[PDB]
Amino acid sequence: MGSSHHHHHHSSGRENLYFQGHMCIQKVIEDKLSSALKPTFLELVDKSCGCGTSFDAVIVSNNFEDKKLLDRHRLVNTILKEELQNIHAFSMKCHTPLEYDKLKSKGS
């Protein structure tokens, strides 16, 4: 038995820690890639490349645990195609809820 793969839209219950629901350029980019890759957790830190604001986002998504290197690459580039247009330099740290749980719950 199995075949369980649910099209979960957006939890709107676990991400209640972030107050970044206020409409802004950051909100747009965040929600756009979030809707596509669907990360259970998304951390956004300022990591300026040197010229202007730059965003360094730690992603936590099961979509990437399948180890589809080229597939996650093509998907990311497709959405971040337009996304990047609004950012001088967007950096991302690819991680899963499995590895994220380690960091948050225990440490290692």
Side-chain angles (χ1 to χ4, degrees):
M1 183 57 63
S3 306
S4 182
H5 196 235
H6 299 125
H7 50 275
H8 183 82
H9 301 156
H10 192 214
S11 311
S12 312
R14 314 185 76 214
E15 55 276 75
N16 69 86
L17 286 71
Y18 291 123
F19 63 100
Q20 289 156 143
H22 188 83
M23 293 302 169
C24 182
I25 184 65
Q26 183 180 330
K27 226 299 90 181
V28 182
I29 278 62
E30 177 246 86
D31 181 77
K32 283 178 66 287
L33 52 83
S34 189
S35 302
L37 303 173
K38 294 181 179 59
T40 43
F41 181 78
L42 185 62
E43 185 67 293
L44 294 83
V45 184
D46 170 71
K47 200 284 275 58
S48 302
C49 184
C51 181
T53 301
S54 310
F55 297 99
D56 207 288
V58 180
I59 82 156
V60 175
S61 178
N62 270 267
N63 187 86
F64 292 66
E65 69 90 79
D66 199 68
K67 298 300 273 60
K68 299 289 294 183
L69 198 287
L70 68 312
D71 190 70
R72 75 188 196 168
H73 179 74
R74 66 197 292 228
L75 263 299
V76 168
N77 297 152
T78 302
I79 286 71
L80 277 67
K81 162 67 181 184
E82 313 178 296
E83 211 80 283
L84 294 185
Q85 294 337 276
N86 297 271
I87 318 180
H88 189 86
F90 183 81
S91 311
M92 71 294 295
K93 273 56 172 182
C94 48
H95 266 140
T96 49
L98 293 310
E99 299 193 88
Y100 173 64
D101 171 78
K102 278 149 53 68
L103 308 180
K104 62 165 213 68
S105 307
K106 44 269 195 173
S108 300

